[PDB]
Design a protein around this ligand. Structure first.
Ligand SMILES: *[C@@H]1O[C@H](CO)[C@@H](O[C@@H]2O[C@H](CO)[C@@H](O[C@@H]3O[C@H](CO[C@H]4O[C@H](CO[C@H]5O[C@H](CO)[C@@H](O)[C@H](O)[C@@H]5O)[C@@H](O)[C@H](O[C@H]5O[C@H](CO)[C@@H](O)[C@H](O)[C@@H]5O)[C@@H]4O)[C@@H](O)[C@H](O[C@H]4O[C@H](CO)[C@@H](O)[C@H](O)[C@@H]4O[C@H]4O[C@H](CO)[C@@H](O)[C@H](O)[C@@H]4O[C@H]4O[C@H](CO)[C@@H](O)[C@H](O)[C@@H]4O)[C@@H]3O)[C@H](O)[C@H]2NC(C)=O)[C@H](O)[C@H]1NC(C)=O
Ligand SMILES: *[C@@H]1O[C@H](CO)[C@@H](O[C@@H]2O[C@H](CO)[C@@H](O)[C@H](O)[C@H]2NC(C)=O)[C@H](O)[C@H]1NC(C)=O
Ligand SMILES: *[C@@H]1O[C@H](CO)[C@@H](O[C@@H]2O[C@H](CO)[C@@H](O)[C@H](O)[C@H]2NC(C)=O)[C@H](O)[C@H]1NC(C)=O
Lengths: 105, 130, 48
C-alpha cells in the first residue's frame, strides 16, 4: 500500500511504480474494501462496459511515456486502493499484482 | 455470471484446505479461471489459472503445492492446499479472466505476448487457519 | 574471456541466445588497474 491524498473535484493522475521495458499492456483494478475488485481499463485504454466513461489511461505509443491513470471527476466515496498490472514484452509473465494506491479525499 | 464461493473459514494448520466456487448463469468451457488470495497487511497475490488443455499454471512463490481442479459435473472450482502453514490466513477471491494478445512485431517470428484481464470477480470467502 | 549471459533468458521466446550480455576485464586509463566493463554481443561473434 502507498499513500495518496486528494480532494473533491480536481482531477487526479496516478501511476504505478513498475516501469515498462517494452510494449506494455497495463490494466487497472479497483479494490474497494469488502466488495469484489472491478476492472477499470485494460490494454491501457480499453475500459469495459459499465465503468464510467471518465477514467482514461495513457495510450501506448512512442515508447517512454509513463503508465499513468486519470480519475478526473473524483467523487467523495473514492476511498479504495487501485492496482496497476503491468504486462510488457521483455519482463515476461507478470505474476505479481504490483503496489496498491490508497485513495483519500 | 456472478460466482458463489462456499468457504468454511476454519481449517486446522498443516491439513487440507478446500474452497469451492460456483459458476452461475453460464457454463465454463471457453473461459480462463484464476484464483487470487489477499492477506491482511498486503495486496492480492495471484495464484494461477486453469483452462483449455487443463494444464493450470501456479505461482512460483507458492512452491506449486496448491492444485486447481476444474469440475464440470457440478460446475465448481475448488482449491486443494496441502502442507498449509498457520500463516495462510487470507480472503480468497474467485474470478475469471480472458486471454488477450499483444503484438509488437512480425507475429510469424513470434513477436507477441499473452496478457490476461480479470473481467469478472467474486465477492470471495474469508478463510483462516486455526 | 567474456562472462556472457543471455539478455533474455526466461524473458521471451525459447530462451534463444540471439544476444549475449558479456562482461570482461579491461585496463581503463592506467595500465595497472583494470576495471570490469560490459557490452552486448551477438551470438554470431562469441565462441564458447
Ligand atoms: C514485413 O512484413 C511483415 C508482414 O506483413 C510486417 O510484420 C508486421 O509488422 C507490423 C509493424 O510492426 C505489425 O503491426 C503490429 O500489429 C499489432 C496488432 O495489430 C492488429 O491487431 C490490432 C488489435 O486486434 C484486436 O482487436 C481487433 C478489433 O479491433 C480484433 O479483431 C482482434 O481479434 C484483436 O482482438 C488491430 O487493431 C490492428 O489493426 C491495425 O491494422 C490494420 C491493417 O491491418 C489497420 O487498418 C487498422 O486501422 C489498425 O491500424 C491489427 O489488426 C499492433 O497492435 C501493433 O501496433 C501497436 O503496438 C505498437 C508497439 O508500440 C504501438 O506503437 C502501436 O501504436 C500499437 O499500439 C496501439 O494498439 C495497441 C493494441 O490495441 C494498444 O494496446 C496501444 O495502447 C496502442 O493504442 C493506442 O495507439 C494506437 C495507434 O494508432 C491507437 O489506434 C489507439 O487508439 C491508442 O491510441 C503493430 O502495428 C504486424 O503485427 C506485423 N505482422 C503482420 C502479420 O502484419 C513487417 O512490419 C514488415 N516489415 C517491413 C520492414 O516491411
Ligand atoms: C547486462 O548485464 C549488466 C551487468 O553486468 C546489467 O547491468 C546491471 O543492470 C541492473 C539493472 O538495470 C542494475 O541494477 C545494475 O546496477 C547494473 N550493473 C552494472 C555493473 O551496470 C545490464 O543491465 C545488463 N543489460 C541487459 C540488456 O540485460
Ligand atoms: C576480472 O578480474 C577479477 C579480479 O580482478 C575477477 O574476480 C576474481 O575472480 C576470482 C575467481 O577465482 C576470485 O578468486 C577473486 O577473488 C576475484 N576477485 C575479485 C572479485 O576482486 C573476475 O572474475 C574477472 N572477470 C573476468 C575475467 O571476466
Amino acid at each position: 500500500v502507498r499513500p495518496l491524498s486528494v480532494a473533491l473535484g480536481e482531477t487526479a493522475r496516478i501511476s504505478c511504480g513498475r516501469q515498462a521495458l517494452g510494449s506494455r499492456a497495463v490494466q487497472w483494478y479497483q479494490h474497494r474494501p469488502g466488495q469484489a475488485p472491478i476492472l477499470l481499463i485494460y490494454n491501457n485504454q480499453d475500459r469495459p462496459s459499465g465503468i464510467p466513461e471518465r477514467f482514461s489511461g495513457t495510450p501506448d505509443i512512442n515508447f517512454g511515456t509513463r503508465a499513468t491513470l486519470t480519475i478526473s471527476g473524483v467523487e467523495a466515496g473514492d476511498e479504495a486502493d487501485y492496482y496497476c498490472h503491468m504486462w510488457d514484452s521483455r519482463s515476461g509473465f507478470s505474476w505479481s499484482f504490483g503496489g496498491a494506491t490508497r485513495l483519500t479525499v | 455470471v456472478q460466482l458463489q464461493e462456499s468457504g468454511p473459514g476454519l481449517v486446522k494448520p498443516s491439513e487440507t484446505l478446500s474452497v469451492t466456487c460456483s459458476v452461475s448463469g453460464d457454463s465454463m468451457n471457453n473461459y480462463y479461471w484464476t484464483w487470487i488470495r489477499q492477506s491482511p497487511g498486503k495486496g492480492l497475490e495471484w495464484i494461477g489459472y486453469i483452462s483449455d488443455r487443463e494444464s493450470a499454471t501456479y505461482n512460483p512463490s507458492l512452491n506449486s503445492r496448491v492444485v486447481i481442479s476444474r469440475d464440470t459435473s457440478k460446475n465448481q472450482l475448488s482449491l486443494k492446499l496441502n502442507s498449509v502453514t498457520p500463516a495462510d490466513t487470507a480472503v480468497y477471491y474467485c474470478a475469471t479472466a480472458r486471454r488477450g494478445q499483444r503484438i509488437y512485431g512480425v507475429v510469424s517470428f513470434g513477436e507477441f505476448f499473452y496478457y490476461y484481464s480479470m473481467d469478472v470477480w467474486g465477492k470471495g470467502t474469508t478463510v483462516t487457519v486455526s | 574471456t567474456l562472462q556472457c549471459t543471455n539478455v533474455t533468458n526466461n524473458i521471451t521466446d525459447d530462451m534463444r541466445g540471439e544476444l549475449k550480455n558479456c562482461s570482461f576485464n579491461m585496463t581503463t586509463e592506467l595500465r595497472d588497474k583494470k576495471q570490469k566493463v560490459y557490452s552486448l554481443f551477438y551470438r554470431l561473434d562469441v565462441v564458447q
